[PDB]
Amino acid sequence: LSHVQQALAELAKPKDDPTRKHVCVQVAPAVRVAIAETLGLAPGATTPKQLAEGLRRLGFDEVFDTLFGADLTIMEEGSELLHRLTEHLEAEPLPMFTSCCPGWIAMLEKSYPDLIPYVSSCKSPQMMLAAMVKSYLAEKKGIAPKDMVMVSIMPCTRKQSEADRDWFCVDTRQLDHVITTVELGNIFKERGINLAELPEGEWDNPMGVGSGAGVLFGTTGGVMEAALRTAYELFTGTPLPRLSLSEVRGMDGIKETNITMVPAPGSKFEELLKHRAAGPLAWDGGAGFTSEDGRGGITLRVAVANGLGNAKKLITKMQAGEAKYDFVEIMACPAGCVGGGGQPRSTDKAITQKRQAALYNLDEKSTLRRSHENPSIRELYDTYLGEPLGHKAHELLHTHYVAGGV
Amino acid sequence: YKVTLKTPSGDKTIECPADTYILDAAEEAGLDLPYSCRAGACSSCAGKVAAGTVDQSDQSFLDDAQMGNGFVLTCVAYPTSDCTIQTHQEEALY
Ligand code: SF4
Ligand code: FES
């Protein structure tokens, strides 16, 4: 039976059933926006509350959002990034690649197993939250990990294989079932439940306490952006706004961005570039700059690759030493994450932009919020995690790759 | 070139230009396929070469070994000759 069907089996069992376990589900914002199309509506018509209300009525016990898991990823990946930078200034190498996309990791495991140490060891948002709920939440609520079943709604089919990774176990799964937008939307229609006719429900807090999804009001700008932001703000001491990715002439689908990082006055980072100055991909040393006064800095070269067929033409440019970058994010979708194979198919060649724009409201877009300001995240990183890249973090928040694929 | 596009809903033998990728012609005619990038991004839009001949240069990891087996990126590939090509099937290349 399909993993989706397996979820429906447990859901069919009564809440007070002796063999019924706790079925928690985590949805992604990219799904919440396109889920409306599955009902024949406009992208973004369905509210996050309506979705949660519908899911809870499907038989689920706890409804969480991937945003909470992403908040953790931003912290871990950001810390690993900062680590890679600081260590290079002191004298895991560079460049550093983002690991969220399951399509990208498969390529570095089967096609380019020489870039393994170049990619982050941090796990994906959903895989982080799934591990967190089956541990911290399990212990806090007082439930055995075997009595907890978790489902996730992802806009990509490749996400199931991601959660199907052998070593992704607890302490036989961190994530048991993954359902796509198209499938979820069909289930709603099959049961006769229209999300457009549902009231404003509510989300569950992965912390076990408090009302809400555990996410504060405000966008992060994305995993890569928020990670870079966290590192930048700690390295420079100055706030970082939204990054405007510009397309690279010669490479379609490839966007780059240069971030001028200046060491904060009175920090170890400032002393690094003052006390000293001077793999298949050998770091060029970083694009640095200085002034005639003695104070300079370094500009971080970030690049985003959209598509697996785009990575092939990008890596070859880096191997030749033509395209010099420090941080590169590789996506397995045509544009962002709102255009995965698990997403609905409407008559529009540019339906991706609509979903991307309807991802957040005008207020949410204007209100910037980082993961290091989240009380829930702060608490988790205190009562259970202890510190980023720590023991527990390396256990459930980090992972490894396999040379040859899974 | 008349290409027999195999779909879950049957087949669609439409006319595909030699200068235009089958992907565009498919949806423009009336078929269930994901169209947005075209520059070879997602592998979900990879067709299956059942017979005939197709031409692809800039693609993903599915190179000649896969092409000769029946794997082609219809977003950046066109039929060099009339033939039958499957559409929805990204699992056969994993
Ligand atoms: S982009 Fe496609 S594949 Fe990568 S995470 Fe978002 S959905 Fe999964
Ligand atoms: S349009 Fe995304 S590859 Fe077919």
Q: Tell me the C-alpha distance between A50 and A196, whole Å.
A: 7
* CA A119 to ligand 2 centroid distance, Å: 25
**Technique used by the depositors:** NMR
User: Residue ranges of the domains in chain A?
Assistant: 1-66+124-198+335-367, 67-123+218-334+368-399
Contact check, Cβ <8 Å, B61/A310: no
Gaps in chain A (C–N > 2.5 Å) come after which residues? 91, 171, 172, 278
A and B: number of Cβ contacts within 8 A: 72
DSSP annotation of A396: I
DSSP annotation of A355: H
Contact check, Cβ <8 Å, B37/A334: yes
CATH of domain A1-66+124-198+335-367: 3.40.50.1780
Q: Please provide residue B25's backbone torsions phi and psi, each rounded to the nearest 5 degrees.
A: -65, -30
| Among B24, B31, B38, B44, the residue to mutate for chain A (most A Cβ within 10 A) | B44
Question: By the 8 A CB rule, do A31 and A181 touch?
Answer: yes
Cβ count within 10 A of residue A21: 15
Question: By the 8 A CB rule, do A174 and A131 touch?
Answer: yes
- Could you write out the DSSP letters of every residue in A243-260? ---EEETTEEEEEEEEEE
- Could you write out the DSSP letters of every residue in A201-234? --PPPTTSSSSSSS--SSB---HHHHHHHHHHHH
- A122 has binding-site annotation: no
Q: Tell me the C-alpha distance between B1 and A397, whole Å.
A: 52
- Could you write out the DSSP letters of every residue in B58-70? S-SS--HHHHTTT
Q: Identify the CA nearest to A164 among candidates A213, A86, A106.
A: A106
Q: Which amino acid is at A4?
A: V
Question: By the 8 A CB rule, do A125 and A152 touch?
Answer: no
Cα–Cα distance list, A194 to A32, A100, B81 (Å): 14, 32, 47
Contact check, Cβ <8 Å, B43/A349: no
Cβ count within 10 A of residue B56: 25
Task: Decide if B42 touches A, using CB distance below 8 A.
Answer: yes
Residue ranges for the known binding site of B are 37, 42, 45, 75
Q: Identify the CA nearest to A120 among candidates A401, A313, A358.
A: A401
* CA A398 to ligand 1 centroid distance, Å: 18
Q: Please provide residue B82's backbone torsions phi and psi, each rounded to the nearest 5 degrees.
A: -60, 135
Tokens of B43: 């592998």
- The partner residues of B86 in beta bridges, in order of sequence, read B6, B48
Atom index in ligand 2 nearest the CA of residue B39 equals 3
Cα–Cα distance list, A116 to A93, A94, A320, B22 (Å): 10, 11, 18, 35
Contact check, Cβ <8 Å, A313/B76: no
Name which residue sits closest to atom 8 of ligand 1, judged by CA.
A156
At which residue do the structure tokens 């700690």 appear?
A234
Task: Decide if B94 touches A, using CB distance below 8 A.
Answer: yes
Q: Which amino acid is at A176?
A: D
Cα–Cα distance list, A63 to A156, A208, A338 (Å): 19, 12, 21
At which residue do the structure tokens 């690993």 appear?
A80
**Which residues lie below 8 Å from residue B8, measured CB to CB, with a gap of 6+?**
B32, B88
Rounded to the nearest 10°, the torsion over CA A221, A222, A228, A230 is 70
Atom index in ligand 2 nearest the CA of residue B43 equals 3
Give, in words, the CATH class of A67-123+218-334+368-399.
Answer: alpha beta
**Which residues lie below 8 Å from residue A65, measured CB to CB, with a gap of 6+?**
A26, A27, A28, A29, A48, A203, A213, A215
Question: By the 8 A CB rule, do A307 and A331 touch?
Answer: yes
In chain B, DSSP assigns E strands to 2-7, 10-15, 46-49, 54-56, 72-73, 77-79, 83-86
Q: Calculate ∠ Cα A340-A342-A348, nearest 5°.
A: 60
Q: Which amino acid is at B7?
A: T
**Residues of chain B neighbouring A103 (CB-CB closer than 8 A):** 43
Q: Tell me the C-alpha distance between A197 and A34, whole Å.
A: 16
Task: Decide if B40 touches A, using CB distance below 8 A.
Answer: yes
Q: Tell me the C-alpha distance between B27 and B41, whole Å.
A: 17
Contact check, Cβ <8 Å, A334/B36: yes
Q: Report the chain A residue with the minimal C-alpha distance to residue B73.
A: A309
DSSP annotation of A196: G
User: Residue ranges of the domains in chain B?
Assistant: 1-94
CA-based max dimension of chain A = 75
CATH T-level topology, domain B1-94: Ubiquitin-like (UB roll) (3.10.20)
Q: Tell me the C-alpha distance between A46 and A143, whole Å.
A: 33
Q: Which amino acid is at A81?
A: L
Tokens of A171: 């302490």
At which residue do the structure tokens 């997602």 appear?
B42
